[PDB]
């Protein structure tokens, strides 16, 4: 019965989110949860999984993307087939760099225009960021980077050959990885400056310190939401972004950008700092880390939905029956909350 029950759970997740089984699997892979043995999953994890699937599925419907499109953006299973697009890339880059000298260049800056030329990219500043991102990720079986790529390209690759050498398998996967990251940039709709910051200093966006920035389903949602937030800021977005990269952003500035009372953000900032959150909110990250910004904004959005101050929301949280085991809020405290 246990096995039957576990098969049934997997089926329900797919039916519930309008996915086929194949699609459920691809989504779980994109989520990162797919490697988990669902049959022996803890309850906390299962509920978490449902919430992640719900969030992501809703988002894909919102973005009008298929699961396959998401999968393409999140997958690390790069193909090895050498296609015309890559053959053209390799010849272009190969020739562009025949005179390349690292002593006078960081390589990435030089490749950036040739890569943009071959990725069908409008800006080499993005190509620069993409190559950098790829180096941090080290995609493919070869854990490829731009420097490894160049050593190979200059030493083994023969332009116009069509046969090359057997190490080309790693090269092909690297090249696809660059294309993958390119699609992420474009589909995300992220500002070029914001993108460079994400790739260069991922901690600003909530990455674990030192981590290569992820391109899995959660990362893509986060970036997408960031981009939507920036568009909302509109013409005042430049001020806010400049103050994000340079850690000067504060409540008054963001509130002005968002047409809010600064006191709304200040109080929400305080409540975010008073309450325990998974990424804790402290004075040091309240307007510097994106996840702390989202936390503060959620305090605000809830306060807005209920037409109450952030202080009111905080008081309601304080009535949590589990936490009440020590506080035992009095009837009077409840009367205030009702008021």
């Amino acid at each position: 019965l246990k096995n039957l029950s576990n098969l049934y759970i997997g089926k329900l997740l797919a039916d519930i989110h309008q996915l086929t089984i194949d699609e459920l699997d691809l989504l779980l892979i994109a989520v990162g949860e797919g490697k988990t043995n669902l049959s022996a999953i803890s309850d906390k994890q299962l509920a978490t999984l449902i919430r992640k699937l719900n969030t992501i599925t809703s988002w894909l419907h919102t973005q009008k993307w298929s699961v396959f499109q998401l999968f393409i953006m999140t997958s690390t299973s790069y193909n090895k087939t050498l296609t015309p697009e890559i053959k053209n890339l390799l010849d272009t880059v190969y020739h562009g760099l025949q005179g390349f000298d690292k002593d006078k260049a960081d390589l990435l800056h030089v490749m950036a225009p040739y890569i943009a030329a071959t990725l069908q990219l409008s800006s080499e500043n993005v190509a620069h960021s993409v190559l950098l991102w790829a180096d941090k990720l080290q995609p493919g079986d070869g854990a490829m980077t731009a420097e490894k790529f160049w050593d190979w390209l200059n030493t083994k690759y023969t332009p116009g050959s069509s046969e090359a050498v057997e190490t080309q398998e790693h090269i092909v996967q690297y090249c696809q990885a660059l294309a993958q990251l390119e699609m992420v940039y474009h589909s995300t709709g992220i500002n070029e400056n914001a993108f460079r910051l994400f790739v260069t200093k991922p901690e600003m966006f909530g990455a674990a310190t030192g981590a290569a920035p992820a391109h899995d389903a959660l990362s893509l949602i986060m970036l997408t939401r960031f981009a939507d937030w920036v568009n909302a800021l509109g013409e005042k977005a430049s001020s806010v972004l400049a103050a994000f990269e340079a850690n000067s952003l504060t409540a008054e500035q963001l509130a002005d950008a968002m047409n809010l009372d600064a006191n709304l953000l200040l109080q929400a900032s305080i409540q975010a700092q008073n309450h325990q959150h998974l990424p804790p909110v402290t004075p040091e990250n309240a307007f510097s880390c994106w996840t702390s910004i989202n936390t503060i904004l959620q305090w605000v959005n809830v306060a807005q939905q209920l037409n109450v101050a952030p202080q009111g929301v905080s008081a309601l949280v304080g009535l949590d029956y589990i936490q009440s085991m020590k506080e035992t809020p009095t009837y009077a405290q409840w009367e205030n909350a009702a008021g």
Partner: protein, 97 residues
């Protein structure tokens, strides 16, 4: 309407399959910009050589016509050549006078 959908798809296939597609221009832009930048440094070097020759000839190693910034990264180097041409013209005028 179904016909229009098919026709739209045909127009799109044409737009993507024709030689003069977006991919072509992205390629051309990238390659030319790379050339343009290198050409710019060489152009500057000759302009500087003319400037040093000017300074030598008139015994005045202080005069300056060539300023930094002809190439503005923000605008991908546009009008850098025009900027240099003005500097050369200024030298010519100074020399004649």
């Amino acid at each position: 309407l179904k016909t229009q959908q098919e026709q739209t798809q045909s127009q799109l296939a044409f737009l993507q399959r024709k030689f003069s597609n977006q991919a072509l221009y992205n390629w051309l832009r990238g390659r030319l910009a790379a050339i343009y930048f290198q050409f710019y440094d060489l152009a500057v070097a000759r302009c500087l050589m003319a400037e040093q020759a000017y300074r030598w000839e008139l015994n005045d190693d202080s005069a300056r016509f060539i300023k930094p910034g002809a190439w503005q990264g923000t605008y991908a180097g546009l009008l850098a050549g025009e900027t240099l041409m003005l500097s050369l013209a200024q030298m010519e005028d100074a020399h004649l006078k």
